């Protein structure tokens, strides 16, 4: 996250921190994710497509710091790693950039809700806030494009939804942005998602209720004028979500 503020998991209790274990034993941060039910975290396919082996992953919930422990945090393995069959990446755009991680403790259980661990609601079918709506993003992503390390503390910021018409101007992203994606940005171009924020939530208060409207997906640079953050439009993937979380 460029700009915004440091935050704690109690403010974003659906946030999931997703790591990968390497041969040798080192663990690196991969991407964010969001708990949508006790057994399920939703994230982005581009995060996993080069290393699709579920055994390589570690998922934390209730965690506020990148490489240290938080009281009440819970650690999970990935029981099933579901990537979208139709995922693709062009020069800039990722398409169908959505993944599901079925999580379980070492004891075989799903998450236990607490004050620092909670599910976030899915939107209803094609139900998105109007452009101009303020929504929040959360992640451990870069604070500046020049950074090579991620922040140690979780961050959040607020961005506004940008119309498709605005986002599809040739000097924005033209027709690379599709109907299955949402753009969001800062009107003054000072705050944004950045590398490392992928997979994490874009949350909007929708009909008075906190809703997973988007998933951090792609963009050109970070907090660059005329280049909004691009998000998987969750409400266009409900059948996919439902079918893979059924069985
Ligand atoms: N400012 C939105 C674009 O931020 C990024 C970047 Cl710089 C890289 C990646 C990546 O996949 O490396 C993803 C996002 Cl959302």
- For the chain, the domain total comes to 2
Only one residue has tokens 């944004």, namely: 192
Measured distance CA(152)–CA(75) in Å, rounded: 18
Only one residue has tokens 């969750």, namely: 234
Report the greatest alpha carbon distance in the chain: 52
Same domain, 126 and 176: yes
109 CA to centre of own chain:
23
Nearest in space to 79 (alpha carbons), one of 239, 244, 200: 244
Phi-psi group of 39: left, alpha or beta (phi > 0 → left; psi -120 to 50 → alpha; rest → beta): alpha
> How many residues can be counted in the chain?
247
The residue whose CA is least distant from atom 10 of ligand 1 is 195
Same domain, 126 and 7: yes
- The answer to whether the beta carbons of residues 83 and 49 sit under 8 Å apart is yes
- The answer to whether the beta carbons of residues 226 and 171 sit under 8 Å apart is yes
Cα-to-centroid distance, 45 and ligand 1 (Å): 13
**CB of 222 closer than 6 A to ligand 1?**
yes
The residue whose CA is least distant from atom 4 of ligand 1 is 194
Rg (CA), the chain: 17
Token duo for residue 99: 């993944």
Measured distance CA(26)–CA(241) in Å, rounded: 32
Q: How far is CA 144 from CA 29, 32, 136, 151, 194, in A?
A: 17, 18, 18, 10, 8
Domain extent at residue 220: 1-12+120-235
Instruction: Name beta bridge partners: 121.
Output: 211
Measured distance CA(218)–CA(88) in Å, rounded: 12
The residue whose CA is least distant from atom 6 of ligand 1 is 195
Same domain, 147 and 92: no
Residues 6 or more apart in contact with residue 87 via CB below 8 angstroms:
45, 46, 49, 94, 95, 96, 97
Residue of 157, 194, 228 with the most ligand 1 atoms within 8 Å of its CB, for mutation: 194
Token duo for residue 133: 């709506």
Same domain, 55 and 5: no
**CB of 192 closer than 6 A to ligand 1?**
yes
Same domain, 138 and 91: no
Measured distance CA(107)–CA(135) in Å, rounded: 36
Same domain, 38 and 139: no
Residue 45, SS3 per DSSP? helix
- Approach to solving: X-ray
Same domain, 106 and 139: no
Same domain, 244 and 195: no
Instruction: Name beta bridge partners: 83.
Output: 99
**CB of 195 closer than 6 A to ligand 1?**
yes
**CB of 232 closer than 6 A to ligand 1?**
no
DSSP of 79-130, one letter per residue? EEEEE-TT-EE-SS-EES--EEEEEE-TTS------SS----BPPPTT--PP
Q: Report the C-alpha dihedral over residues 172, 177, 183, 188, rounded to 10 degrees.
A: -10
Structure resolution, Å: 1.8
DSSP 8-state symbol, 169: S
Cα-to-centroid distance, 142 and ligand 1 (Å): 9
Which helix (H) or strand (E) is 136 found in, with range? strand 134-139
Between CA 45 and CA 51, with CA 48 as vertex, the angle to 5 degrees is: 150
CATH code for the domain in which residue 127 is found: 2.40.10.10
Token duo for residue 191: 């705050």
Token duo for residue 213: 């409207």
Same domain, 87 and 40: yes
Instruction: Using the Cα atoms of residue 21, residue 139, residue 154 and residue 17 in order, give the sign of their dihedral.
Output: negative
**CB of 33 closer than 6 A to ligand 1?**
no
**CB of 231 closer than 6 A to ligand 1?**
no
Measured distance CA(30)–CA(186) in Å, rounded: 25
Same domain, 157 and 93: no
Tell me the catalytic residues: 46, 97, 198
Q: How many helices (H) and strands (E) would you count in the chain?
A: 2, 15
Same domain, 184 and 247: no
Same domain, 142 and 192: yes
Q: How far is CA 175 from CA 88, 168, 182, in A?
A: 15, 6, 13
């Amino acid at each position: 996250i460029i700009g915004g503020e440091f935050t704690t998991i109690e403010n974003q209790p659906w946030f999931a921190a997703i790591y990968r274990r390497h041969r040798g034993g080192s663990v690196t941060y991969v991407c964010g994710g969001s708990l949508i039910s006790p057994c399920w975290v939703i994230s982005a396919t581009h995060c996993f497509i080069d290393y699709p082996k579920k055994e390589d992953y570690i998922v934390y919930l209730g965690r506020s710091r990148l490489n240290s422990n938080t009281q009440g945090e819970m650690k999970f393995e990935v029981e099933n790693l579901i990537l979208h069959k139709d995922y693709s990446a062009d020069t800039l755009a990722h398409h169908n950039d959505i993944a599901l991680l079925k999580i379980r403790s070492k004891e075989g259980r799903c998450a236990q809700p607490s004050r620092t661990i909670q599910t976030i609601s899915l939107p209803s079918m094609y139900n998105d806030p109007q452009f101009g709506t303020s929504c929040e993003i959360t992640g451990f992503g870069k604070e500046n494009s020049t950074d090579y390390l991620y922040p140690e503390q979780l961050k959040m910021t607020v961005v506004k939804l940008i119309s498709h018409r605005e986002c599809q101007q040739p000097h924005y992203y033209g027709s690379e942005v599709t109907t299955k994606m949402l753009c969001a940005a800062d009107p003054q171009w000072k705050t944004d998602s950045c590398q490392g924020d992928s997979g994490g939530p874009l949350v909007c208060s929708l009909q008075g209720r906190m809703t997973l409207t988007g998933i951090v997906s792609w963009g050109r640079g970070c907090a660059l004028k005329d280049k909004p953050g691009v998000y998987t439009r969750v409400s266009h993937f409900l059948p996919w979500i439902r079918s893979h979380t059924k069985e």
